[PDB]
Amino acid sequence: MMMKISFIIATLNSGGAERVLVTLANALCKEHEVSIIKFHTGESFYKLENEVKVTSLEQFRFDTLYHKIASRFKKFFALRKALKESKADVFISFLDTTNIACILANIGLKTPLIISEHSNEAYLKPKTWRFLRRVSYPFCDALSVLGSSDKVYYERFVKRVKLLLNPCHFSDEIPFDSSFEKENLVLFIGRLDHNKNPVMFLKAIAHLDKNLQENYKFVIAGDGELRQELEYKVKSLGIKVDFLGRVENVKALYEKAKVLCLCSFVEGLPTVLIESLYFEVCRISSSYYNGAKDLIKDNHDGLLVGCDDEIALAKKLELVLNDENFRKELVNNAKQRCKDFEISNIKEEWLKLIVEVKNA
Ligand SMILES: O=c1ccn([C@@H]2O[C@H](COP(=O)(O)OP(=O)(O)O)[C@@H](O)[C@H]2O)c(=O)[nH]1
Ligand SMILES: [Cl-]
Ligand code: NA
Ligand code: NA
């Protein structure tokens, strides 16, 4: 058959949850009718297939006390409005606060709703939001999670929880056979906020051999609050790092890069550590809270570093950039994990979840 599937998400900016949603929608939009309701006006950062319909909610003032109060009430009823007109067989909502809003807005409407979490359980820190997540999530029809630790946490107060890995859209484009002409390039792709911890990337570059810094180009793809602070630590440390802002063609960067470094403290299942697999990019990652070992088998598929260890990241960096035959062997083993993130297999596991919850 064919189903109307409505995705609900706050924004569609250069983030991981957004990348997965566009990947899923683009895959489902051929055989089903998929719409996307987003709170933020503006165009999707990721290329979206013409068949998926995107509707952005009204824009509301937030400058004054009356509007800060009124806009939220107006936002809720515009979302309840959009849900009714979508005429969907199923709703799929993304990320913590938007899941709760959909739980409430969907009250009354006769369509099942699937919520999905994307960071670890622990990334949501405020005491109050952890509570509203606890009382409201039992009222969903199913919950998609990324790791086994989050499955165990939510299963005790959510009845249907399914673990669905992130699908990588590069598994369609990039053929599993391609040779790469690597350059002396090292990537840090991610948001420039505290948890991504990009300062660890900078301090680790400063501790690299003078030969490596002189003959390698280090770039930071992404943006965030810490952008200007990092620009000044690059001068404080006296290194050469190329800030690129948000980048559409990460395929080009992944195509030339030899190493990608992830330095986060807490993560669910980082897509930069998945996308890298298709481009023979060597992953060096901090042992972020939880995931870690299921993406990187240390010294076999990649290199792991303790959390916030600027020197350990530097020694691992020199290991790979001073031993191309070892980085190649590290990276050829990583190719085995490509099958785990193929779009076609993961789309069919969402379709099982959708028809399973559609038995209401
Ligand atoms: O300048 C950028 C920065 C990031 N991304 C994409 O945004 C995603 C990052 O998601 P991640 O797995 O790191 O999880 P998140 O940091 O969003 O929680 C990746 O697919 C990147 O390819 C991008 O396309 N351009
Ligand atoms: Cl994510
Ligand atoms: Na705000
Ligand atoms: Na993530």
Residue 215's Cβ-count burial label (10 Å; 0-12, 13-18, 19+) is: exposed
Q: How far apart are CA 282 and CA 322, in angstroms?
A: 13
- 8 A C-beta contact, residue 8 and residue 93: yes
Write the CB contacts of 116 (distance below 8 Å, at least 6 apart in sequence).
92, 93, 94, 95, 99, 143, 144, 145, 164
Torsion angles phi and psi, residue 27, rounded to 5: -75, -45
The two three-digit tokens of residue 306, written as one number: 């303790």
Ligand 1 first shell, C-beta below 6 A: 14-16, 19, 189-191, 221-222, 246-247, 250, 270-272, 275
**Distance between Cα 131 and ligand 3 center (Å):** 21
- Give the closest residue to 149 by CA, choosing from 319, 14, 268: 268
Question: Please, what's the largest Cα pairwise distance for the chain?
Answer: 65
The technique is: X-ray
Torsion angles phi and psi, residue 54, rounded to 5: -115, 130
Q: How far apart are CA 158 and CA 228, in angstroms?
A: 42
Q: How far apart are CA 32 and CA 51, in angstroms?
A: 9
Q: Give whole-number Cα distances, 253 to 31, 58, 188, 189, in Å.
A: 32, 36, 10, 10
CA 244, 249, 252, 257: dihedral to nearest 10 degrees? 50
DSSP character for 262? E
**Distance between Cα 308 and ligand 3 center (Å):** 30
Is 272 a known ligand-binding residue?
A: yes
Other beta carbons within 10 Å of 141: 21
Is 275 a known ligand-binding residue?
A: yes
What is the residue extent of each domain of the chain?
4-170+341-358, 171-340
CA 235: distance to chain centroid?
30
Three-state SS letters, 45-110: CCCCCCCCEEEECCCCCCCCHHHHHHHHHHHHHHHHHHHHHHCCCEEEEECHHHHHHHHHHCCCCC
Amino acid of residue 255: E
DSSP letter string, 335-356: GGGGGGG-HHHHHHHHHHHHHH
Q: Give whole-number Cα distances, 321 to 215, 248, 257, 318, 327, in Å.
A: 11, 27, 11, 5, 8
Is 169 a known ligand-binding residue?
A: no
Pocket test for ligand 1, best of 14, 269, 285 (most atoms within 8 A of CB): 14
- Ligand showing the shortest atom-to-Cα distance for residue 40: 3
DSSP letter string, 184-238: SEEEEES--STTT--HHHHHHHHTS-HHHHHH-EEEEE---TTHHHHHHHHHHHT
Q: How far apart are CA 353 and CA 1, in angstroms?
A: 15
Amino acid of residue 319: L
- Give the closest residue to 189 by CA, choosing from 48, 19, 12, 8: 19
Q: How far apart are CA 289 and CA 29, in angstroms?
A: 34
Is 259 a known ligand-binding residue?
A: no
What are 47-52's contacts with CB under 8 Å, separation 24+?
47/22, 48/22, 49/25, 52/25, 52/26
What 3-state class would DSSP assign to 30?
coil
Query: Which residue, by CA, sits nearest to atom 21 of ligand 1?
Result: 272
What 3-state class would DSSP assign to 36?
strand
- Give the closest residue to 284 by CA, choosing from 266, 269, 301: 301
CB-based burial, 87-113: b 16+ in 10 Å, e otherwise:
ebbbbbbbbbebbbbbbebbeeeebbb
- 8 A C-beta contact, residue 221 and residue 187: yes
- Ligand showing the shortest atom-to-Cα distance for residue 72: 3
- 8 A C-beta contact, residue 353 and residue 142: yes
Q: How far apart are CA 261 and CA 270, in angstroms?
A: 12
**Ion ligand 2 contact residues with beta carbon within 5 A:** 16-17, 118
Q: How far apart are CA 20 and CA 29, in angstroms?
A: 14
- 8 A C-beta contact, residue 174 and residue 276: no
Is 358 a known ligand-binding residue?
A: no
Q: How far apart are CA 286 and CA 271, in angstroms?
A: 14
CATH superfamily of 171-340: Glycogen Phosphorylase B; (3.40.50.2000)
Other beta carbons within 10 Å of 69: 11
Pocket test for ligand 1, best of 262, 272, 273, 296 (most atoms within 8 A of CB): 272
Query: Which residue, by CA, sits nearest to atom 23 of ligand 1?
Result: 14
Is 15 a known ligand-binding residue?
A: no
- 8 A C-beta contact, residue 195 and residue 227: no
**Within a 13 Å sphere around the CA of 99, how many CA atoms are in the beta-carbon half?**
26
- Give the closest residue to 130 by CA, choosing from 148, 157, 112, 105: 157
DSSP character for 150? H
Write the CB contacts of 50 (distance below 8 Å, at least 6 apart in sequence).
none
CATH number of the structural domain 4-170+341-358: 3.40.50.2000
What 3-state class would DSSP assign to 123?
helix
Q: How far apart are CA 2 and CA 4, in angstroms?
A: 7
**Distance between Cα 110 and ligand 1 center (Å):** 35
- Give the closest residue to 186 by CA, choosing from 288, 239, 254, 274: 254
Same fold across 4-170+341-358 and 171-340: yes
Q: How far apart are CA 117 and CA 145, in angstroms?
A: 5
- Give the closest residue to 279 by CA, choosing from 294, 249, 258, 309: 258
Torsion angles phi and psi, residue 283, rounded to 5: -95, 120
Residue 306's Cβ-count burial label (10 Å; 0-12, 13-18, 19+) is: exposed
β-sheet bridge partners, residue 279? none
